Amino acid sequence: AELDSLLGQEKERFQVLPGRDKMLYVAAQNERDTLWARQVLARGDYDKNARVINENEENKRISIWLDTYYPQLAYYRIHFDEPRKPVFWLSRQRNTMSKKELEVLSQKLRALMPYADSVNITLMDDVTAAGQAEAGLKQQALPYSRRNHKGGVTFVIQGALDDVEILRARQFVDSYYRTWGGRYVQFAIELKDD
Amino acid sequence: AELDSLLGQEKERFQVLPGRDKMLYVAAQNERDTLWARQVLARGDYDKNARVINENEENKRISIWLDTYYPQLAYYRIHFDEPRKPVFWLSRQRNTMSKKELEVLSQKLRALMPYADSVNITLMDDVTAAGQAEAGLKQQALPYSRRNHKGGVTFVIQGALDDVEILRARQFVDSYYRTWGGRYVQFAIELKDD
Amino acid sequence: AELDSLLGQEKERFQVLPGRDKMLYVAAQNERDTLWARQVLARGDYDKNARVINENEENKRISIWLDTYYPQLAYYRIHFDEPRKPVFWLSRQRNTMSKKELEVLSQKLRALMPYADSVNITLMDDVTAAGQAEAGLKQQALPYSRRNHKGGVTFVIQGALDDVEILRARQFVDSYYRTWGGRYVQFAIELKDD
Amino acid sequence: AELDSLLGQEKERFQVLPGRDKMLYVAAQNERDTLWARQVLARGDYDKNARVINENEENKRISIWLDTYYPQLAYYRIHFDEPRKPVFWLSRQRNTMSKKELEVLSQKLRALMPYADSVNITLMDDVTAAGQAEAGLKQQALPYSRRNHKGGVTFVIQGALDDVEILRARQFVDSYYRTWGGRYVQFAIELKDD
Amino acid sequence: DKDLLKGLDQEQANEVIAVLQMHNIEANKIDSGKLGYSITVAEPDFTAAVYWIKTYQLPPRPRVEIAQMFPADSLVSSPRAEKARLYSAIEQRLEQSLQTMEGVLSARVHISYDIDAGENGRPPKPVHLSALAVYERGSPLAHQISDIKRFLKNSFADVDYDNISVVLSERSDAQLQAPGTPVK
Amino acid sequence: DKDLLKGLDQEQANEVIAVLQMHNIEANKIDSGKLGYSITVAEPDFTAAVYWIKTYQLPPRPRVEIAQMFPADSLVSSPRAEKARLYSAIEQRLEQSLQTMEGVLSARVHISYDIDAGENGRPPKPVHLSALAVYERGSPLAHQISDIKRFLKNSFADVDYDNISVVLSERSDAQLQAPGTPVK
Amino acid sequence: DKDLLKGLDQEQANEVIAVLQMHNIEANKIDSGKLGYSITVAEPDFTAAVYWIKTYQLPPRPRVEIAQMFPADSLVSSPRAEKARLYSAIEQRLEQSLQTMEGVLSARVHISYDIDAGENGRPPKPVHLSALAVYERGSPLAHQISDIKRFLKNSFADVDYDNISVVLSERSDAQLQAPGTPVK
Amino acid sequence: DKDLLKGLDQEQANEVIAVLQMHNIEANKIDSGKLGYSITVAEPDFTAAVYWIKTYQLPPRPRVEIAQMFPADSLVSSPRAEKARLYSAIEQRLEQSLQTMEGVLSARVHISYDIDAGENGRPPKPVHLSALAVYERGSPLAHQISDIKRFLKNSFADVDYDNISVVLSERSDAQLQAPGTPVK
């Protein structure tokens, strides 16, 4: 059978991507339906070769690659909202690369991802990256402490936190870590007492 | 059978490399699937001779070799992200070798690795090696102590650490030890009390 | 059968060396697979005569010889990374032998090792021998005490050591004893209290 | 059968020596395989007469002889690294024998050992004999006490020794007693307390 | 057809199946009468099935309650043994009652167990409470944490809002797709 | 066909198989009725199988619980013997409850056992807690360590956040490939 | 064909084989029914086999636990005899739990056993801990020694990091080659 | 064919053979069923065999443990008789655990036995430890003596490094050659 029918009964959580390298790629959405789609491709009921790519695993797969061939590169995350044309967020204020080498970077990230048609490297401000993480963190009424560095900022949130401020934090951190990644700003929710 | 089918059912965790020395090389990814691929080659269901090379074992196999024929060589690690053309990181500021002897070094590391087509020795700064290990270590909000030496630097992290600062450390150290190795900067996570 | 097949199923931990003295030599790697290869040659399933030479035993076999016919010779170790052409490390600063007698020494170590084609005696500094043992010992953050002598140096490491400083020591000492031997610098990891 | 096959299955720990006195001599290596080879020659499965000579027993067999026909002779040890041409170490500074009587001594030690072709009496310094026993004894970090005499020196090592200084001592003493014998310098590892 | 687990309880069978069917392998509950149930998966799905048995530590233990260790079978019981059977019965009743709230699907409530009220002359220390709650989707999930801390407060002797730790969460996404038979 | 282990429990059989199938050797669980299960591997895979039996110390012991040493079979029990059966029941119940959190797959919880509250006049010392947790992948794994320290704090008498040591980790990579029969 | 050891347990048979097959001699486990197993090696391999039986002190004793010396068979037990059966149960449970960490394959945990808490008026002295751990290869082996000292600290009454001695090591290199039949 | 020793245990037979085969005489273990084993050597090798029986004091006594003298068969036991059965169980467990270290093949651990903690009003004196260890070859044999003194220290009440005497040694050279039949 063809792989659009070998998966689950309803077909839109699984975005089947025609590849480039004689292969076909399955864009799972979260961690659990990766294990749904990997179970199909591992029991052996699909004759061709196929992978299951995740938005969370293909971020930390290229970050293995990008920590070697392009070190000291200040970036955030690849977004796979459109997996055929992903968006590689890059820091505007902490790079010295001009646009001579950015299509060199895009045409090499395109070689890593055969499902990707073109990788849109866009440059955004790191001030709004720590701005959206602070304007959102005061809006949750969380007692924090900003520790500015170069190439990074830490929002240490200590203290004897009650129940709802551990829950408003983890709803905000997880809704922030999906967007901006955890490479510029780290949230240190440590929980002491008096 | 040919070894692309004698391995597991899904074939991209195992990068089969045609060798040079009448032999064929299997590039396993982590430690566990090395034991997957070594089990095939040891039960005896593949007629030719074949090895299982690892990114972690072929680093400390050449470091046995390179501690003998090139002692007092300041280097970091070989990266096997592309195993046919691996990248040998070398320290820029702690070597006296000119580029007269670097292709002598590359054509002898090429003789150690028959899967390798050419070994790209690139020189990087040791200041960023201790810079990326310190800018990342303050970003985890870890109380440390830098001890500079020549040919090395120690970030001693002592004290009565709580739960999350032992966990943020080991996520950072293991994501650092994979990249820069443990030959320049040592992380001493020792855990005292008051 | 021929001895390349009488050993284990996978053949690269055992480097079979054609000898000189009507004999064939097996270069085992560590101590355990010496007992793998010696078991073949002792049950009696190989018709010719054959030895199992080790990198650790052929160092202390020639050191029995070299403590008799060349006493007061300051040397380090023979390296068997290439067993057909081993490398005999010799101290540069503590010998009075000129190169008139070094090929006399090499052509007599060649007579001890029929597998060896030529024994490369290279002279290295004893200052780096105690330098690599001290720059590495401060990098492990170990509280030590250097005791300089002529023909030797002792790095006494006493005190009530905790768990990780006994483990960082033995990883460093064993990675040092393999390279430079234990004939110039001795590591005295003695463990007192207060 | 001939005695090269009546011994163990693998033949290089036993160096069979053709004698002079209608007899054949077996050069065992250590004390245990002397009892291997003496068991062959005592059960009676070899028709000719044969001895088992040891490096440790033929030292104290000639020292019975040499304490009678050449008393007040300052010497160290016979080395049987090449048993067909053994090396009789003699003290350079404590003898009055010229080379008129040394071939008289060598041609009479040759009569004691029918396996020996010629006994190479070489003269070495007693200052290095106590030098190699003191430079090695400080290198083991052992608290000792030198007691100089004529014809002898004692390195008394007393005190409440801990575990590793009894073990570093006995590794050094046994690696020294094999080389220089116990006729010039005595190691007195006595173990008191406070 | 290859078995995984047999001799299982009715509790344990529907929970091992609900694990495997969440991970795209179809389990087949075979009843064996007096012996208990038995779960057999297909032969291509056998490798992944025995992985999730190890990973989720299946078959599950029965729900350990504190009164199961201090039973009514003993004719005489120590005064510590009836406070721990009292406090066991209260926290079973609170989690029977949180499940009857709006939105809550499951609940586990724990009590700080006082032992030595009469053993040393020390007065009884403050009671601590801890509750889990699994909600339906679409809930205003930061706002029900104040109902439960209000409800659990006035159900005991003298507790504070710093002594009640409600750790609640939404449920997982609904498993409604059938797993699918492996074709061979 | 050559046996490794027979007479095994249902617990022990699915865990020895899950070890061997992780290391590319296919185990064959043969049931023997009243005797228990039996695991036979192939004859080329027998050498590697008996290595991982020694290495992982298989077959596993049953899960040692503290109440198994202080049973209810004794008609009379010392007051130390019902505090250690109480604290055993609590830490079984906490690890039944951490597994019902979001993300957590397994949990092992340990209690500091007070013994001499009434033996010397010393007041009861502070309770110490220690928890393991095995998570699904993709978790924000440094942030759930504050939920568990919040949850475990208000489940006991008087603990601090320095007395709760949560050591959690993500699970291993999923074993989904079948091992593969050795051809001969 | 010549026997070495018969009447062996299931524990002892798979561990004597795993020794001999590591040293290039092929063992043949013969079952004898009610008598236990029996291990026969070949006749050229008999000399080397009986050497490693002496050297590794095989067949192994069963794992000595402290509660095996203080059993529940006695109807009355001294208060020292239930602290030593309590502390035996804790250190069995800790080493059941360290094996469930990431990377750890085996673990042996020891407790300093206090005996005379109530025999002389001396307060209970500090508890000392000691753990072994055998890891998979490729581990950052100097960094897991701080997890275990964190985990073992808050599992007891009042311990320090100077009182916990974790001595861990990587496992041996994997024995995967079959030994090989001696040709005659 | 001439007998040496009959009626031997499985322990004693493989250790008398391992002595004789080390000294170039081939032993032949003959089983006698319910009577135990029997070791017969050849008639030319009989003289040397009975010498090494006298010299090594064969057949060996079974391993004397301290709990074998203070058994659980007695329904009542003195408080000295359960401290000596406790300390016996600890030193059996430590030597079961040192054998699981890297490099160690055998281990014998001894404890200083305190007897009169409650007999004279004297406080318990310091515990002394002594360990043997037999290593594989090629070990950095002066450096493992600090692991064992670290490991044995925090396994007891209050010991010092001057009270732990570790006397370790490498093993003998491997006996792999077959002895050889005497031709007649």
For E35-81, the DSSP string reads: G-EEEEE-STTHHHHHHHHHHTTPSPPP---GGGTS-TTSSS--HHH
Which amino acid is it at H26? Answer: E
Tokens representing residue B173 in the block: 């150290």
- Contact residues for F93 (Cβ-Cβ < 8 A; gap 6+): E64, E65, E66, E110
What SS3 state is found at H70?
coil
Tell me how far CA of residue A60 lies from CA of A66, A183, B44, G54, G82, in angstroms: 9, 11, 36, 52, 52
> What is the Cα–Cα distance from C72 to C95, expressed in whole angstroms?
9
Residue A187: closest CA among B176, F146, B132, B140: B140
Q: Is the dihedral of CA D176, D177, D178, D184 positive or negative?
A: positive
List the chains bordering chain F where 3 or more Cβ pairs fall under 8 Å: A, B, E, G
> Going from the N-terminus, what domains does chain B have, and what CATH number goes with each?
1-53 (3.30.70.1780), 54-124 (3.30.300.170), 125-194 (3.30.70.1770)
Side chain identity at F63, as an amino acid letter? R
Q: Which element (helix H / strand E) includes C108?
A: helix C102-112
Dihedral of the CA atoms H144, H146, H152, H158 (nearest 10)?
A: 170
How many Cα neighbours within 13 Å face the side chain of C156? 15
Q: Which two tokens stand for residue A107?
A: 């045409």
Task: Determine how many CB atoms are found less than 10 A away from the CB of residue B16.
Answer: 16
**Binary contact (F47, G97; C-beta < 8 A):** no
Q: Do C31 and H136 touch (CB under 8 A)?
A: yes
Question: Buried (b) or exposed (e) across F103-117, using 16+ Cβ within 10 A?
Answer: bbbbbbbbbbbbbbb
C-beta of residue G178 within 8 angstroms of C-beta of residue F47:
yes
Beta carbons of G143 and B173 less than 8 Å apart: yes
The answer to whether A151 and A165 are in contact (CB under 8 A) is no
What contacts H55, CB < 8 A, 6 or more positions away? Answer: none
G150: chain B residues, CB-CB within 8 Å: 161, 163, 166, 191
Tell me if residue D154 falls in helix, strand or coil.
strand
Question: What is d(CA H96, CA H92) in angstroms, rounded to the nearest whole number?
Answer: 6
Sequence-separated (6 or more) residues with CB below 8 Å from residue D159: D143, D191, D192
Residue H166's identity, in one-letter code, is V
Q: Which of D10, D12, D81 sits opposite C68 (nearest CB)?
A: D81
Contacts C–H by Cβ distance under 8 A: 43
Chain C residues in contact with H143 by the CB 8 A cut-off are: 169-170, 173-174, 187, 189
Q: Where are the beta strands (DSSP E) in chain C?
A: 15-18, 24-27, 50-53, 75-79, 87-91, 120-124, 145-149, 152-157, 185-189
* Interface contact flag, H150 G165, Cβ < 8 Å: yes
Q: Does the beta carbon of F147 lie under 8 angstroms from any beta carbon of chain E?
A: yes
CA distance C8 to chain G (A): 6
Provide φ and ψ at H96, rounded to 5°. Answer: -70, -25
**E neighbours by CB contacts (3+ pairs under 8 Å):** A, F
The CA distance from B138 to A186, in Å, is 10
Query: DSSP letters along H103-121, please?
Result: SEEEEEEEE-----TTTSS
d(CA A104, CA C133): 44
Do the chains contact at H141 and D1, CB–CB below 8 Å?
no
Nearest C-alpha of chain D: how many angstroms from C186? 7
Contact A189, F159 (CB under 8 A): no
B90 DSSP β-pair partners: B75, B123
Cβ atoms of residues D168 and D142 within 8 Å: yes
Chain B residues within 8 angstroms (CB to CB) of chain G: 30-32, 35, 38-39, 42-44, 54, 56, 161, 163, 166, 169-170, 173-174, 177, 187, 189-193
| Strand ranges across the sheet with A75-79 | A75-79, A87-91, A120-124
Least CB–CB distance from A164: residue in E142, E162, E178: E142
Of C13, E157, E40, the C-alpha closest to G176 is C13
Question: Is residue C49 within 8 Å of residue D10, measured between CB atoms?
Answer: yes
SS in 3 state form for chain B?
A: CCHHHHCCCCCCCCEEEECCCCCEEEECCCHHHHHHHHHHHHHCCCCCCEEEECCCCCHHHHHHHHCCCCCCCCEEEEECCCCCCCEEEEECCCCCCCCCCHHHHHHHHHHHCCCCCCCEEEEECHHHHHHHHHHHHHHCCCCCEEEEECCEEEEEECCCCCHHHHHHHHHHHHHHHHHHCCCCEEEEECCCCC
Sign of the CA dihedral with C122 first, then C125, C128, and C133 last:
positive
Q: How far is Cα F81 from Cα B70, in angstroms, rounded to an integer?
A: 66
For D87, the enclosing helix (H) or strand (E) is strand D87-91
Closest CA to H142 of B64, C144, C178, D172: D172
C141 bridge partner residues: none
- Does the distance separating the beta carbons of F86 and E80 come in below 8 Å? yes
Residues of chain B with Cβ-Cβ distance to C7 below 8 Å are none
Task: Please count the residues of chain E.
Answer: 184
**Strand-pair partners of B89:** B77, B122
User: Best residue in H66, H86, H96 to probe G by mutation, most G CBs within 10 Å?
Assistant: H86
Is residue C122 less than 8 Å (CB to CB) from chain B? no
- Cα–Cα distance measured from residue G52 to residue H17, given in angstroms and rounded to the nearest whole number: 12
How distant is the alpha carbon of residue A67 from its chain centre? 15
Among A43, A68, A147, whose Cβ lies nearest the Cβ of B141?
A: A147
The SS3 call for residue A62 is helix
- Say how far apart CA H139 and CA A15 lie, in whole Å: 57
State the Cα angle at G109 between G108 and G113, rounded to 5°.
140
AA letter at A125: D
Strand partners, A146: A155
- CA-nearest residue of chain F to B167? F142
Q: For A42, which of F137, F150, F177 is closest by C-beta distance?
A: F177
Nearest residue of chain A to residue E43 (CA atoms): A43
CA distances from G109 to B166, F24, G62, G114, G157 (A): 22, 31, 17, 16, 16
Torsion of CA G117, G120, G126, G129, to 10 degrees: -60
CA distance A40 to A6: 7
Question: Which residues in chain C are closer than 8 Å to D122, comparing Cβ atoms?
Answer: none
Cis before residue F59, ω within 30 degrees of 0?
Answer: yes
3-state secondary structure G102-157: CCEEEEEEEECCCCCCCCCCCCCCCCCEEEEEEECCCCCCCCCHHHHHHHHHCCCC
Do C141 and B68 count as a contact with CB atoms less than 8 A apart? no
CB–CB contact G178 B170 (8 Å): no
Q: Is D71 helix (H, G, I), strand (E, B) or coil?
A: coil
Residue A104: closest CA among A126, A119, A89? A119
Chain D contact probe: residue of H19, H24, H128, H175 with most D CBs at under 10 A: H24
H-helix or E-strand spanning residue A153: strand A152-157
Closest CA–CA distance from residue F59 to any residue of chain E (Å): 14
Total residues found in chain F within this entry:
184
E143: its two tokens: 């706002």
Distance between H76 CA and the closest CA of chain C, angstroms: 42
Q: What CA–CA distance (Å, rounded) separates B152 from B129?
A: 10
Cα F167 to the center of its chain, rounded Å: 14
End-to-end CA distance of chain E: 12
- Is the previous residue joined to G59 through a cis bond, with omega within 30 degrees of 0? yes
Residue B63's closest CA among B112, B121, B125, B2?
B112
Q: Which residues contact F115 (CB under 8 A, 6 or more apart)?
A: F80, F83, F84, G83, G86, G117
Rg of chain G taking only CA atoms, in angstroms: 21
Residues A78, A110: contact at Cβ < 8 Å?
Answer: no
Q: Which chain B residues contact residue F178 at CB under 8 A?
A: 9
Instruction: Please give the structure tokens belonging to residue F184.
Output: 């001969």
Q: How many Cβ atoms from other residues are within 10 Å of residue D133's Cβ?
A: 22
Q: Which two tokens stand for residue D142?
A: 């052992």
Chains F and B touch, using 3 or more CB pairs below 8 Å: yes
Q: How many residues does chain C have?
A: 194
Say whether D16 sits in a helix, a strand or coil: strand
Q: Which residues contact H158 (CB under 8 A, 6 or more apart)?
A: G125, H126, H127
Find out whether F42 and F182 touch, Cβ atoms under 8 Å: yes
Which sign, positive or negative, has the C-alpha torsion G82, G86, G91, G95? positive
- Taking CB atoms and an 8 Å limit, are C167 and G183 in contact across chains? no
* Cβ–Cβ contact F31 with E under 8 A: yes
Q: H12 — alpha (psi -120 to 50), left (phi > 0) or beta?
A: alpha
With contact defined as beta carbons under 8 Å apart, do E92 and E122 qualify?
no
Quick check: helix, strand or coil at residue C27?
strand
Q: Nearest Cα to G156, choosing from H157, F124, F111, F125? A: F111
Cβ atoms of residues B35 and F23 within 8 Å: yes
Helix (H/G/I), strand (E/B), else coil: A64: helix
* CA H151 to chain CA mean position, Å: 20
Q: Are E114 and E125 in contact (CB under 8 A)?
A: yes
Helix axis angle for F10-20 and F46-55, nearest 10°, is: 120
Question: Residue H69: CA atoms inside 13 Å, Cβ hemisphere, count?
Answer: 10
C9–B188: do the CB atoms touch at under 8 Å?
A: no
Q: D75 with D89: CB under 8 angstroms? A: yes
Name every chain H residue with its beta carbon within 8 A of the beta carbon of C33. none
Which residue in B has a C-alpha nearest to residue G160's C-alpha?
B193
How far apart are alpha carbons D81 and D166 in whole angstroms? Answer: 29
**C149: nearest CB among D132, D138, D178:** D138
Decide if F47 and G179 are in contact by the 8 Å CB cutoff: yes
Closest CA to F94 of A159, E98, E113: E113
The Cα–Cα gap between H95 and H133 comes to 9
**Would you kindly state where each structural domain of chain F is located, as residue ranges?**
1-60, 61-170
Among candidates H127, H128, H168, which has minimal Cα distance to H145? Answer: H168
CA distance G146 to A22: 47
Quick one: CA torsion of D109, D114, D117, D122, rounded to 10 degrees? -20
Spatial contact of F143 and A173, defined as CB atoms under 8 Å apart:
yes
Neighbouring residues of G57: CB distance < 8 A, sequence distance ≥ 6? H99, H105, H106
Residue of chain B minimizing CA distance to G177: B42
Resolution to 1 decimal, in Å? Answer: 3.3
Query: Buried b / exposed e across E111-124, counting CB within 10 Å, b at 16+?
Result: bbbbbbeeeeeeee
Q: Which chains sit next to D, with 3 or more Cβ pairs under 8 A? A: C, H
Q: Which pair of tokens denotes residue A175? A: 């809704």
Residues E79 and E84: their CA atoms lie apart, in Å, by 9
Calculate how close chain F gets to A160, using CA atoms only, in Å: 9
